[PDB]
Amino acid sequence: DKELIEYFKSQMKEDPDMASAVAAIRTLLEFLKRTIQGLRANLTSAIETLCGVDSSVAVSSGGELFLRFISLASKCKKIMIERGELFLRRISLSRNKIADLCHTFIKDGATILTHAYSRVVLRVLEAAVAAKKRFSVYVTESQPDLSGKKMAKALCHLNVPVTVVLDAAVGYIMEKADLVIVGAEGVVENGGIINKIGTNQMAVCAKAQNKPFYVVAESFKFVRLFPLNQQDVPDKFKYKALKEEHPWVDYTAPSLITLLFTDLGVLTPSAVSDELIKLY
Amino acid sequence: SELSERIESFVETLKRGGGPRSSEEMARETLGLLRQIITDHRWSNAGELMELIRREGRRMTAAQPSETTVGNMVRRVLKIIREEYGRLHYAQLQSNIIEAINELLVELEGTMENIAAQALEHIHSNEVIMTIGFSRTVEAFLKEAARKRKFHVIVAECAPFCQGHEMAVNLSKAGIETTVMTDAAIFAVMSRVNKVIIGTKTILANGALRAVTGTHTLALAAKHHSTPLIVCAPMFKLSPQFPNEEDSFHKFVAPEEVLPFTEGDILEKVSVHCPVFDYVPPELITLFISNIGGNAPSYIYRLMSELYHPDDHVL
Amino acid sequence: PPLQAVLVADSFDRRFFPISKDQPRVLLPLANVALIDYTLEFLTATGVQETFVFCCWKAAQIKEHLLKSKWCRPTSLNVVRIITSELYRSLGDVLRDVDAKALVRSDFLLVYGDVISNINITRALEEHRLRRKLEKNVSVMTMIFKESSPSHPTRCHEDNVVVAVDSTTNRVLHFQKTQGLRRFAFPLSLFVEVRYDLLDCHISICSPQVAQLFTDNFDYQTRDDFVRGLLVNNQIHMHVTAKEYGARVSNLHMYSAVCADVIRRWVYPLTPEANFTDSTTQSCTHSRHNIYRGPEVSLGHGSILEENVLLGSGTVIGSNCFITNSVIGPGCHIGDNVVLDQTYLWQGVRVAAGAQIHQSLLCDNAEVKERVTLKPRSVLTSQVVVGPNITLPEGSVISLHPPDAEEDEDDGE
Amino acid sequence: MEFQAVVMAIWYPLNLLERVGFEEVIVVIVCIPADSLRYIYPKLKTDVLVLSCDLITDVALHEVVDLFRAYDASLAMLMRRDFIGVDSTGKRLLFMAADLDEELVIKGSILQKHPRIRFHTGLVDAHLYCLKKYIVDFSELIPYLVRKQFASSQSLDIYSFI
Amino acid sequence: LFSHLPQYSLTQFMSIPSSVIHPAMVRLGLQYSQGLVSGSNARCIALLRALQQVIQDYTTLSRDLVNKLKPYMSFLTQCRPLSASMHNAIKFLNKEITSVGSEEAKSELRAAIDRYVQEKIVLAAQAISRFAYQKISNGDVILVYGCSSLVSRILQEAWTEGRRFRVVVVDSRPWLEGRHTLRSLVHAGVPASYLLIPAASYVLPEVSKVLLGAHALLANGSVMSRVGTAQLALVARAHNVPVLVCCETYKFCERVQTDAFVSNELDDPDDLQCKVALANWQNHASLRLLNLVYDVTPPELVDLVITELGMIPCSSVPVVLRVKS
């Protein structure tokens, strides 16, 4: 109950490249290793405490799928841990599938524009330079955590011309961008995405100039929310935990998104919804 | 005096009811009153004359702030005074203004024939036009194009005052293949409509427009299907007021037009409003067929500078 | 011929008691405007010259207000000629005083001095004159009823007159006030529609014979007596409007109904922002939800005016207040965190803090202290003070006069 | 068999019924033998059209039948001493009085529900009556039932045609 | 023009004890024609009750019942053109009759109407109410339009489950139908406001979300409903307020339509004149009075569809049309 939080923090510690939701799944499944009737009640408390320490959408989404990817099977605890281990085996290969689908969408000599920092966009570009494509990356230093500089330092090792553009200068450099690639922190039920603050005005500018806005999310980031504006995003997700507002996420409408390169194949935004309807 | 009682007769019939039906008669009565004020009050120079006309137009505008055709023709007389005192810079000035006012009046009474003359340039055979309310200028615009070509006008009657009924009968009497519809079907039959020709209550100073209610919905439907929204409106309907949030824009008539008094007890809990004027931003307007041409909305500001002095914008 | 009118500016039912003790019930403000200034303006909208004004009870206030009003200036095309006498005890004395002075020589409008309406008596007047010359003085009156619905706030369930009308000629054949009644008795001699959806509205267009018919039969006192006493004997007809407002302010209930109807623009040429009386101290701006604020009002911080609010000139409002559906009056002080819902506050009030006024009427110069919780239907007459803890009950009148109240000018009696 | 027309106790009603389309006409394919409908009760309990052979001639009774089918009226009457009071629409019966009373007293609740009551005096009763199957349960019951909407053997609603 | 769509102002020819059409079906058709039954859900309930009456009076089955009650639906298409809720109801009924193999099949059929009305018109309404409770927050103001048996149910149960919102009722001539919403709101105690469609752009500045009802959702996501809905949703998007449409699954028609011209019933034009200057409109040869009953809003003007399955983005209504069939 308390060892769960420190074990989740550990699963952050020995690998930061592993996603937050995947860390939640790993600590959740290791909690499942330790009556099995109504065990959803035990795991729901684990989900609530795990979303307490991490405010991200993916932790309360990917953990929700594991609450029901084990509950689609309905002793049964052994088939539960077997199917859960299969679930973990098939989300360790998400970023590779996304990279394989998405690096073919980057033309040679292109000039992409990305946002804050994401292990998926970084992997898309890592696979694109491994396919002997050459391009340049514009990354916005996203306030307040400055993870644009972290991405550009993590992407300069790939020998890519990367430019840490200002957070305000998206509308300036949007015309110098062939395509926009962002990593979603959660994909809501209408096909839009919930991503680090500033993704929305990246999209709104991009559609103002008809630049394709590509999103590279994963399968476990499919959350059941249906926002209609930036109000409808819950305060659980926006606020991470001289007056200042300071959210950390904002909703991007599905009309602004050209394609999603999720784990389960390339989707139009309209193709997201039944991929949530199927999981129900 | 006869003039003074005629001034508050005009002010009272402006607050309370009607009097002049059309805006052309409203502007003609306004010039009649302003010309009478010039002739019959005693003033020495144009200074206190401008002050007198300014305060009379101030009370005529505060009488009914949504009747801007009165407030424009106060400003045109002020511009006329400033430009007929400028060219003498007295004694004969009192004559000169009157002459210019007469040249303004014959500039009126031919505003409709110079808008109707441009009908054939903008209306073609086998087209289809949509109109919202009864406009005297738009009707005469549709009459002049009717005697040469053959078209089909859809008059979306503007509820609650079903005043597109009185236009679709006027158009049907002249053989235009008219069609009156409920005006809940503006977007529905918009897909088959070639042009929208509407009238205004007021053209604001940015090319924005104050029309009968349901026009902004009509304009949005026209912009959706990219149907050109032609606007037939003369230069007394051109007011040098930008869409402030300070002064009141709308006019709100009794809710009996919308929800009748015979509804009973639910009228103590329900807030019924009934505005009569709708704001149309200039980006939904395509043309302003004036009496001097067919110029774009993004020229309307220049028409302000040739009509009203900048000091006379606020009275 | 020119159209005249008789305006009985003293309602002869002791109905607004004790508010009638210190201000006449024709001069008390409806929505920052005295009631007579509605009906007078009504007559000016109709086309009425020579609007005789009959005042008996406290004619000093009424005359000194009329001579400083809009219709006593020579610019107005509605001359008044105030008739002042203490001889009048009822409307019958008023219409009998019309004779022996011959003030009317054609058909005239008899409004009752507290009518509030935007009725246009030209259709009704032309219909009345059409069947006046035609049948040679068969008709003597043409009552004006509004096509209402029987379950309406404006219908007080104290007037609620039912009529029996001949639908082909609009003649009134029966007429009775259904104040206390469950089943309505209609005699069979009148054999013919029977209508209950008629707001009375008191704008009869009685011909001068009516002034004759009040003098010879001295027993009549009021118009209800006249219509009842001549439908047993010379033919009251009627005209029913549907698109125009009309109602008088007989009691304080229908006061609240008509004041809420005026704010919601049901009397459209007579809205508070129209400033139909040309006073400089009653200008308004109809903002968004029938929220009218006068000049120099200085709304506080965080205070919410939801809807149907009228604020007079000089109406500083505190912080985090909540004012709905009410009239606050021309120049008064409202403090912090108050709630003013369906209230009616006249010229000058001290509402201190945190008060919860919910269906009341606060007259002019009435003060209330901190943390006072006036309940519905409470009336605070002029110059009263209510102390810092008086959660006074519903339906309680407080006045400086001791016997005509349920309290006095101190903290909760 | 929606309507089962009943004839009181002559070629005019039977010819009108055959012109409408009726296959059988009971007279109290014609059955041999105003409480006479109670003696013809062992008929099928369909909707009835109680009719009397006197003072009936070539009326478009179909339209009156429509007032039975439009509104699911408990009663539909044909009219062409007793005063009736109809609604503002001119089809809904509200107050059927003969002149037994000295005063036409009206319940106030009718007037609050229906404010405009048009009173017709001495209309000719067309000897045609339309009833549902429950009004026959065990003029007569024609002014009683119009009071019964203010008995319940299924409020009810009763319409008339003039 | 509107030549293919039919203009109507029909019981004079049929015998009073009718044998061509069933008695219940005659009552139903004439109630449709006069206007006693309005609304897609109310028309579907009344149709299914009349069909239960038809089946319980049927005496002999699979082919016979279908080709016997096809003239009934021809009569109903004559009296008032069938909305797609009625169309899918009739399609389900014909599939049910053809599915019944070789007396006792009449009771099993009649309960399948009850198992149709419950879990697709009533239980679906409860599920849509539960889903739309989430999208209704405290303090917001909701613009509804006309009368819908589902929209008003959603508002009433959202109010009685603790929300404190406000409704603006937008209404259109000549049906003046949102009064039936408005009064039904005031009985529930909901604060309300009423105004016509031309004033919609006046109150869309204050409106938080537009909650409409759908008479049919087509196979591309276009929402076929009452004639003011598409225009209202267009002005709603121009004032950037979200548009929610609340539709059950069974109203999903596989017919597809782009413009508001293909399947749009015309009510009689004589409704249009208001108190008159238009009473003599027949004698004016050039003058034609046109009132549509339905129009389609495109799926880009609708932000959300609420359905008993869930909340779907109006571009995945063919998804639901797939998974229910």
Ligand SMILES: O=P(O)(O)OC[C@H]1O[C@](O)(CO)[C@@H](O)[C@@H]1O
């Ligand atoms: O690293 P991930 O899992 O791709 O997360 C994607 C998004 O989440 C964030 O890292 C935090 O919001 C964002 O910077 C990024 O766009």
